[PDB]
Amino acid sequence: KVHYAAIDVGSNAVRLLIKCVNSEGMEEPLSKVLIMRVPIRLGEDSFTKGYIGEEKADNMVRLMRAYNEMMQIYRVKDYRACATSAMRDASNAEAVIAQIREKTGIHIDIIDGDEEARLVSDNHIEQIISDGGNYIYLDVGGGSTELTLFSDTHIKHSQSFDIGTVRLLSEKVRPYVREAFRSELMAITKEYTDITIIGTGGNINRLVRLSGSDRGSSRYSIMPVEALHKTYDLLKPISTEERMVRFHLKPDRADVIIPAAEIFLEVADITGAKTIIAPIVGLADGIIEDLYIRHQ
């Protein structure tokens, strides 16, 4: 009956996640009970205007009220709300957040890239990487991409890069950012072989399903990089509203799925990774793991 909630204020959708604490004998201590995903796309303002415009600020207030009602319905014990790239990069970020407290009671923390990269479900990663192999946990968002290297059950390198789906669509990725990202991947490939990608983000979960790799009754959904590539070639050459209708994609997903696939494919090409494991956890899950640990 204990519930925790996380609010993930990213650069495309803004999410609410609620999880329950399970019984002791169960495997995972925590199970998802409710997930909401609302496409405010703050990054569309942030990365092109430099600030959050009034329409999205007001919609964020409305959304935070809605998520507050939902947290009240589940009588959640504790929560945290984090915002990432699009709020980091907005000049009026503090004003927008203060309006949201005043009007809704919800307190949003702005977290930097480093905190973002480590705000993960270590419990899920620990179990995936326990064979001691080499893994790259890759979170592709709307404004940034976090890469964490795992080898021999131990964390080796963790970095945030300002390449994301909405920033790419807006054509606002800045000089030398792609190059630095490529250079980091090559230094990883020179030193780590047989890399498996652990892919997270709303885009990779939809890609895994479009490519025929849905989890189903399995513990993990596992997508070959070749399956992703074939799916990419299917999606790239048609327009976005045709992608919507033909493949049952929400409008806020049908455009960003392309640069998302391109990021994963670049990472896979450089590292020679053949497999993407998609555990369907993300930043919200990492918030709830922290909350669970805090309260024991």
**Residue 116 labelled as part of a binding site:** yes
**Are the C-beta atoms of 284 and 83 separated by less than 8 Å?**
no
Q: Does 39 bind a copy of itself (CB under 8 A)?
A: yes
Q: Compute the least distance from the CB of residue 17 to a copy of itself, in Å.
A: 12
Taking the complex as a whole, the smallest distance from the CB of residue 104 to a copy of itself amounts, in Å, to 10
Sheet holding 30-38, edge to edge: 30-38, 14-21, 3-9, 78-83, 108-110
Q: Establish whether 144 is an annotated binding residue.
A: yes
Residue closer to a copy of itself, measured from CB, 152 or 248:
248
Any known ligand binding at 240? no
| SS3 assignment, position 295 | coil
List the one residue from 2, 48, 65, 170 that touches a copy of itself (CB under 8 A). Answer: 65
Q: Is 221 annotated as a binding residue?
A: no
- Compute the distance between CA of residue 162 and CA of residue 157 in angstroms, rounded to an integer: 17
The answer to whether residue 234 forms part of the interface with a copy of itself (CB under 8 A) is yes
Q: Which stretch binds a copy of itself (CB under 8 A): 85-93, 143-151, 191-199, 213-221?
A: 213-221
Query: What x/- string results for residues 243 through 272 when contact with a copy of itself is judged by CB under 8 A?
Result: -xxxxx-xxx--------------------
CB of 140 to Mg ion, least distance (A): 4
141 contact choice in Mg ion, a copy of itself, none (CB below 5 to 8 Å, kind-dependent)? Mg ion
Q: Is residue 210 a contact point for a copy of itself (CB under 8 A)?
A: yes
CA 19 to chain centre: 17
251: left (phi over 0), alpha (psi -120 to 50) or beta: alpha
- 26 SS3 class: coil
> In the complex, what is the shortest distance from the CB of residue 279 to a copy of itself, in angstroms, rounded to a whole number?
10
289 known member of a binding site: no
DSSP output for 225-269: HHHHHHHHHHHTTS-HHHHHHHHT--HHHHTTHHHHHHHHHHHHH
Helix/strand/coil (H/E/C) assignment for every residue in 73-112: HCCCCEEEEEECHHHHCCCCHHHHHHHHHHHHCCCEEECC
Question: Which residues of this protein are in contact with Mg ion, per CB under 5 A?
Answer: 10, 84-85, 140-141, 144, 201, 203-204, 290
- Which pair of structure tokens corresponds to residue 129? 């990487």
**Binding site residues, a copy of itself, CB under 8 A:** 20, 22-23, 26-28, 31-34, 36, 38-39, 59, 62-63, 65-67, 69-70, 72-73, 209-212, 214-217, 231, 234, 241-242, 244-248, 250-252, 280
| Annotated binding-site ranges for Mg(2+) | 116, 144, 146, 200, 290
